[PDB]
């Protein structure tokens, strides 16, 4: 099927050069009427685009940003290429490819396939990998969850029972804390009878530092209480 | 370079309401337009190609019109799946320029938040550090007010808030407030408390526990 997948550092320092990937299948860029595109949206901010390539290696690029952009393919490779230099902290962005297809035909839906994006963050600081704490339940619902402190840099992605429980789950937006590393928490609801019986693991993964954790959420205990 | 101008920035209609999101250009882009659906954390789904035409398996409801600079996307009745940024965009000029995106939020009927609250792990305590957890789940309007007391001492400066956003099934919000504390200052106290102020409760509600005390 149609993909289309961002690949990149999501750390990269004030003055030095931003590289991105965008790896496709399902269509060519060798194939007329075909393009790729690149376009960035700061946290809670609005879409921008930055440049895009044609089949025939026409460059399109932003102008404001055009000193710093440079765009290229690899049609062998179905894989397209952004540089980005002088990175500055206002350039904390997601940054997504999109593809084009039958160009300027009744068949060109515009920019209709999308990838998830990469968050790049322009920043100084160490990469630091979280902690992971449980947040224990304890018959109505009961709440649970887990805590992933002192991370950087964003993001942290987070499931439970690998997927298979999403029902009632709440992931919290990543707070800034004072030390300069982030934290956030994701909790579920869950009826009370389940905690004996149903598991309940928490899956976090902070890929910026290559660290994943599997973590049992366990009702506590009054024994051990010193 | 092509503005695109949308309005309202942002917008609170409830479910089975007629939406209609405007989007003027600077200058003429025919109808080389396109308007996007992006929920948050996502990237941008394509609701119409071409100003007018409908994208293969879009609700019926979604609908777009305009010629020229003057654009419209009208939701014929809004729905809780709705809830999204909704974004104009056009494709008559390089470079591609969007609209400032219009932000719709569900309105639904008061909900009351389920409030629960979580002493530090003895894993964080382990590590030297203490962190209190106070949930707000499942709650509608946003507007909510959360307070700690230690040792019925109203704290500040010393807590962080987390909403998420609006759910796409039942419209509410959810709030998580953190309050953080080193080892030596958490054994320094015993009773710790959230206070949950809201409007869908009749009376401020309270979850607390005392330290030492399971």
């Known amino acids: 099927q149609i993909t289309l997948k961002e690949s990149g550092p999501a750390l990269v320092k004030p003055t030095q050069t931003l590289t991105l990937t965008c790896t496709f299948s399902g269509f060519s860029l060798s194939t007329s009427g075909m393009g790729v595109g690149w376009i960035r949206q700061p946290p809670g901010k609005a879409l921008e685009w930055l440049a895009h390539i044609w089949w025939d290696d026409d460059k399109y690029y932003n102008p404001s940003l055009k000193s710093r952009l440079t765009i290229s393919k690899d049609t062998s490779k179905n894989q397209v290429v952004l540089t980005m230099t002088n990175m500055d902290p206002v350039d904390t962005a997601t940054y997504y490819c999109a593809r084009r297809a039958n160009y300027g035909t009744s068949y060109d839906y515009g920019m209709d396939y999308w990838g998830q994006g990469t968050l790049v963050t322009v920043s100084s600081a160490s990469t630091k990998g979280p902690s992971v704490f449980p947040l224990a339940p304890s018959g109505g619902t009961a709440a649970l969850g887990c805590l992933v402190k002192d991370y950087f840099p964003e993001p942290v992605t987070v499931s439970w029972n690998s997927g298979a429980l999403t029902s009632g789950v709440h992931t919290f937006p990543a707070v800034l804390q004072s030390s300069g590393l982030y934290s956030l928490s994701s909790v579920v609801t869950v009826p009370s009878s389940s905690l004996g019986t149903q598991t309940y693991i928490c899956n976090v993964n902070h890929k910026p530092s290559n660290t994943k954790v599997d973590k049992k959420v366990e009702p506590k205990s009054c024994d051990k209480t010193h | ?214």
């Open chain 2, 1 to 214: 370079d092509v503005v695109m101008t949308q309005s309202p920035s942002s917008l609170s209609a409830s479910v089975g309401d007629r939406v209609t999101i405007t989007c003027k250009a600077s200058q003429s882009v025919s109808d080389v337009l396109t308007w996007y659906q992006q929920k948050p954390g996502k990237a941008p789904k394509l609701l119409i190609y071409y100003a007018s035409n409908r994208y293969t398996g879009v609700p019926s409801r979604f609908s777009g019109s305009g010629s020229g600079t003057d654009f419209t996307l009208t939701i014929s009745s809004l729905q809780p799946e709705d809830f999204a940024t909704y974004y104009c965009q056009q494709g008559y000029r390089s470079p591609y320029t969007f609209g400032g995106g219009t932000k719709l939020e569900i309105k639904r009927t008061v909900a009351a938040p389920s409030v629960f609250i979580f002493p530090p792990s003895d894993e964080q305590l382990k590590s030297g550090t203490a962190s209190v957890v106070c949930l707000l789940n499942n709650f509608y309007p946003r507007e909510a007010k959360v307070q700690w007391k230690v040792d019925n001492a109203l704290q500040s400066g010393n807590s962080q808030e987390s909403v998420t956003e609006q759910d796409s099934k039942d419209s509410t919000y959810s709030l998580s407030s953190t309050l953080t504390l080193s080892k030596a200052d958490y054994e320094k106290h015993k009773v710790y408390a959230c206070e949950v102020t809201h409007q869908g409760l009749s009376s401020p509600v309270t979850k607390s526990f005392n330290r030492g005390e399971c």
